[PDB]
Design a protein around this nucleic acid. Structure first.
Ligand SMILES: [Mg+2]
Ligand SMILES: [Mg+2]
Ligand SMILES: [Mg+2]
Ligand SMILES: [Mg+2]
Ligand SMILES: [Mg+2]
Ligand SMILES: [Mg+2]
Ligand SMILES: [Zn+2]
Ligand SMILES: [Zn+2]
Lengths: 221, 80, 113, 202, 63, 127, 97
RNA sequence: CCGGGGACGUGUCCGUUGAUCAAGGACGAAGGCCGGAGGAUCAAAGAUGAUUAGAUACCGUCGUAGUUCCGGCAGUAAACGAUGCCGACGGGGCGAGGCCAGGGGGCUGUGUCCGGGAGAAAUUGGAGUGUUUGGGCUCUGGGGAUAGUACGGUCGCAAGACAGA
């Protein structure tokens, strides 16, 4: 069992907030056990790259393994995190909880028309990490994920099914090539389209809406 | 702050060409010599000496911008 | 010699928890320390009880900004309650400089340069 | 309508030298300036603009359900009792001295509560808190001087913080409007005895 | 999926922005007391760090 | 410079800066109908020309729903079957966006030239 | 990379600054790049000032100052320690103490 | 003395006369070359005295070309901001420019500091407004080395230069 020290996980353990309305009001997920509680069924961890970094000290090269991992549900949510540690299995479970803290929603869209369920990225966007430019392009249905091996693993966990991609720069740098491809999905999802031109009246955010309700849960313990 | 309606405070600060409508800082005027009954007329940013013809004194001398007026002269702007 | 954090953080806790039972003389200050703690080796008692006296000398002057003692804020709040010579009564026909009065021309009183 | 300043309250801020603003003003501050003293080269702050930013700050303060969630901070020792007399009165959590960085982000430390608002005495003196608040989606009211920076500050209260009485007057008046917003106490406060607790006397 | 439109810019608030702040303001009575209803305000990240969030919120709440 | 491309860049600078009005120091005949076409799709709210007997002045109110406006120089001769390929380059998605052609029916949108059976010269875009 | 924003010298909006000779090395350094230390000290050193009071003809004699502009090239200025070893962020200091 | 120059100021004139450039032309530090004049200092070359394992160098001394001027050639530099020109737009602060205004002002130069944006990063008011990629125009680059070398060409008294595998 996990004890939700964070205030948002208090409302998550109480089931006050769904997954989709965390990112509605832009509340930072401090603790990783929030989203594994919400996505207890579907959450797949997939290791992108294990590589070993070194610093030369006085005696010998201090070598440590640096892993970069991607987590995601079946469709809609994806995150990436990286941790470097002395032994790789310590680094992976540290990277996974960092990825779970950094899950972002990916809005999917329709390529041409609104029939069926959504399958592709909604707009054309570009994620740019250091010197790696990944550009996602909406693809018609059945086209599949047209990408390299590392973005396709992110694209599978993000739940897109048809995408055309373009890359520039040093895509062998796979931490940058993974950080760019989620940044495109980050940017294509919050592209401001005429479907969302409709102004909604703003709503009170749930952590200050349930601001009375959280303090008794600490007073219970 | 509205760009289509610039306040009268900001218009005199900004450049004459950079206003919403290009507005002159110059004008014309009348110079009144005391020994002399006529009123010689001249430009504000004048580039020529102006002297009252009879009872000959020098009214304004040209300068870098506005012409500086010499001696005892009453000036009146001319706008209408 | 220089004490370490195993001694200093210890001796900080002794003077903080048990201040009134202490005194400036070291041998009495050690005699409380066997009575009130459990420290195994007799040299390391003298390491701690020595620095307790080096603390209790400067906490008698009240110099340390960290530790906090129940007697030392109730004496402080007597010092805090100054018999107030607030200048709101001491200033009569307030001299405000030439441009400072002009900003208060809507609702004004006590006009002086 | 607009709430009018008491002659009692405006009596305080002139001898607080809160309108004695600073020698320099930024273009973000010029709307808070009626004029500047041509003698001392000191910008004199608008009191009417100062008072209405106080009531917006009071409006923003009470809007949270619990005032104890609000973590008010002051780096300097001038406002040590100005925040101590504040939090006994308003029922908020005080932060005095050096704000330990990571105080809102690092979850290994649980000294205070997760903030839903912070208000600081000075963005120059508490640049660490106003940055750390922006990492956790937390609003920031600030008392801000004429020379001071105002980035990552939601509500600027244009007032001086370089006098010992000045933040003592400002934290007093911000406590005065708060219970006036709740209707807990009107302006019938008799400042003869109250504001001196906020004052820094030593 | 829905994203918060910032009130002052009119732009959507960017994806997972920490500087983005929820702003709550109670409506004010005629005598100056608090009321139960609340103005709810959405603020983009970059307009805070520019420092331009102050002067816009002055004129919006002056209305 | 090019007065259309200078107009589109100066709009984008004010748009990215969250400004609500942009004063542009010049109007032409082609950027008048470009901003009026930008208005009817709701991308810009308040449009006011100013006749100062020189180049011109237009003050564009920024609606907040303009991602980017641009100008395509040189104005490529495009047939009917090419503008469907050209809109795929320029616009982000098929569901929205406006590619503007200077065809014989008028300065019109890429959706309309499909309807009006027109080609013409590509001027710019917005979305 | 570019180590200094001014490239070591104070030359801006010039093409050419005339060279001067180093006071220690006789190197040809431009007047802008050259380290210049204007020293104004007394002619008689301060140890001997009591001995000149006993020896002056004049009541209230003021010992004259010595005026010299030491102009050093870069190589000898660090060797004569006219310029102090500073950090990379310490390089951007410009004020004298 | 003759000549030039930009900025500012202006109800002065003309009215699109413009921007950028193959070709072409002019200028172009130092060193160099030619003819003439001159020659104090310094000083390639050269000569020495030392240093050194050696020392054709660094150090000392001397010394010619040269450094200087006039007429010409040459046409190169880390000729650098290692950043083409023109144009639109874009944050604050501080400075010691010039002109104007007299209302912490405007134009135009010029540095600087902090941010924004950009960038592989150093950094950067352009190296920003770039995959949401299109302002015009000119030039250049396409892994290293061969090599800025050879051949052919043009220019030069020559040195060599341009160009260029
Ligand atoms: Mg040069
Ligand atoms: Mg020469
Ligand atoms: Mg020569
Ligand atoms: Mg000769
Ligand atoms: Mg010699
Ligand atoms: Mg040849
Ligand atoms: Zn006369
Ligand atoms: Zn030297």
């Amino acid at each position: 069992e996990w004890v939700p020290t964070t205030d948002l996980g208090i409302l998550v353990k109480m089931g006050k907030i769904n997954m989709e309305d965390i990112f509605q009001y832009s509340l930072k997920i401090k603790e990783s056990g929030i989203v594994d509680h919400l996505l207890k069924g579907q959450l797949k961890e997939e290791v992108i790259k294990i590589k070993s970094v070194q610093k030369q000290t006085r005696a010998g090269q201090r070598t440590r393994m640096k892993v970069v991992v991607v987590v995601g549900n079946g469709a809609g949510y994806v995150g990436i995190g990286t941790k470097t540690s002395k032994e790789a299995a310590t680094a992976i479970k540290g990277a996974i909880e960092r990825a779970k803290c950094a899950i972002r929603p990916v809005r999917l869209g329709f390529w041409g028309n609104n029939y069926g369920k959504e399958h592709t990225v909604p707009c054309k966007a570009t994620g740019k990490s250091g010197s790696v430019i990944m550009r996602v392009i909406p693809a018609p249905k059945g086209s599949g994920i047209r990408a390299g091996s590392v973005p396709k693993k992110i694209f599978q966990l993000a739940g897109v099914k048809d995408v055309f991609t373009l890359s520039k720069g040093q895509t062998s740098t796979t931490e940058n090539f993974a950080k760019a491809t989620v940044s495109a999905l980050d940017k294509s999802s919050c592209f401001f389209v005429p479907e969302f031109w409709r102004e909604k009246e703003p709503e009170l955010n749930p952590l200050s809406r349930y601001s009375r309700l959280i303090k008794e849960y600490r007073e219970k313990i | 702050k509205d760009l289509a309606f610039p306040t009268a405070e900001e218009l005199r600060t900004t450049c004459k060409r950079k206003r919403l409508i290009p507005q002159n800082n110059s004008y014309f005027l009348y110079l009144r010599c005391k020994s002399c009954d006529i009123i010689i007329l001249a430009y504000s940013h004048s580039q020529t000496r102006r002297t009252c013809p009879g009872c000959n004194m020098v009214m304004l001398m040209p300068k870098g911008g506005k012409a500086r007026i010499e001696g005892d002269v009453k000036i009146k702007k001319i706008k209408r | 010699r220089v004490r370490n954090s195993n001694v200093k953080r210890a001796a900080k806790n002794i003077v903080e928890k048990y201040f009134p039972k202490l005194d400036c003389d070291f041998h009495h200050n050690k005699r409380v320390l066997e009575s009130v703690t459990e420290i195994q080796t007799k040299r390391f008692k003298n390491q701690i009880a020595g620095y307790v006296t080096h603390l209790y000398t400067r906490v008698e002057k009240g110099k340390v900004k960290k530790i906090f003692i129940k007697k030392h804020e109730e004496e402080r709040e007597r010092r805090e309650n100054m018999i107030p010579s607030s200048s709101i009564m001491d200033t009569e026909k307030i001299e405000v400089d030439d441009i400072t009065m002009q900003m208060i021309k809507d609702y004004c009183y006590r006009g002086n340069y | 309508k607009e709430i009018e300043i008491p002659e009692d309250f405006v009596k305080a801020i002139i001898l607080s030298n809160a309108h004695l603003g600073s020698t320099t003003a930024t273009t973000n501050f010029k709307q808070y300036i009626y004029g500047r003293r041509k003698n001392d080269l000191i910008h004199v702050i608008d009191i009417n603009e100062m008072w209405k930013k106080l009531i917006i700050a009071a409006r923003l303060f009470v809007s949270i359900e619990d005032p104890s969630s609000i973590i008010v901070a002051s780096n300097k020792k001038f406002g040590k009792r100005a925040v101590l007399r504040f939090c006994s009165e308003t029922g908020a959590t005080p932060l005095i001295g050096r704000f330990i960085p990571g105080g809102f982000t690092n979850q290994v430390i649980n000294d205070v509560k997760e903030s839903r608002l912070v208000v600081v005495s000075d963005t120059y003196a508490d640049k660490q808190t106003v940055m750390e608040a922006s990492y956790v989606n937390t609003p920031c009211i600030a008392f801000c001087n004429s020379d001071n920076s105002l980035s990552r500050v939601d509500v600027v209260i244009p007032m001086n913080n370089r006098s010992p009485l000045s933040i003592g007057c400002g934290f007093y008046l911000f406590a005065k409007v708060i219970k006036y917003i709740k209707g807990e106490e009107s302006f019938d406060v008799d400042v003869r005895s109250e504001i001196e607790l906020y004052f820094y006397r030593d | 999926f829905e994203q918060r439109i910032c009130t002052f810019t009119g732009r959507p608030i960017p994806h997972t922005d920490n500087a983005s702040v929820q702003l709550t303001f109670v409506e004010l009575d005629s005598d100056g007391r608090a009321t139960d209803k609340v103005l709810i305000y959405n603020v983009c990240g970059k307009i805070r760090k520019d420092g331009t969030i102050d002067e816009i919120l002055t004129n919006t709440l002056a209305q | 410079m090019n007065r259309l491309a200078a107009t589109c860049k100066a709009i984008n600078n004010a748009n990215r800066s969250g400004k609500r009005q942009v004063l542009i120091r010049f109007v032409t005949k082609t950027t008048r109908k470009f901003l009026e076409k930008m208005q009817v799709c709701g991308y810009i709210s308040t449009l006011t020309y100013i006749d100062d007997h020189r180049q011109g002045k237009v003050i564009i109110g920024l609606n907040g729903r303009l991602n980017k406006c641009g100008a395509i120089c040189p104005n490529y001769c495009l047939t009917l079957k090419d503008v469907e390929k050209f809109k795929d380059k320029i616009l982000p998605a098929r569901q929205f966006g406006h590619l503007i052609l200077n065809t014989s029916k008028g300065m019109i949108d890429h959706n309309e030239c499909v309807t009006m059976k027109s080609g013409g010269e590509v001027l710019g875009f917005f979305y | 990379p570019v180590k200094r924003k001014n490239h070591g010298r104070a030359k801006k909006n010039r093409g050419h600054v005339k060279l001067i000779r180093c006071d220690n090395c006789a190197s040809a350094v431009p007047k802008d790049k050259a380290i210049k230390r204007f020293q104004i000290k007394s002619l008689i050193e301060a140890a001997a000032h009591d001995d000149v009071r006993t020896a002056t003809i004049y009541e209230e004699y003021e010992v004259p100052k010595f005026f010299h502009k030491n102009q050093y090239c870069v190589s000898c200025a660090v060797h004569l320690k006219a310029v102090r070893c500073r950090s990379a962020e310490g390089r951007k200091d410009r004020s004298n103490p």
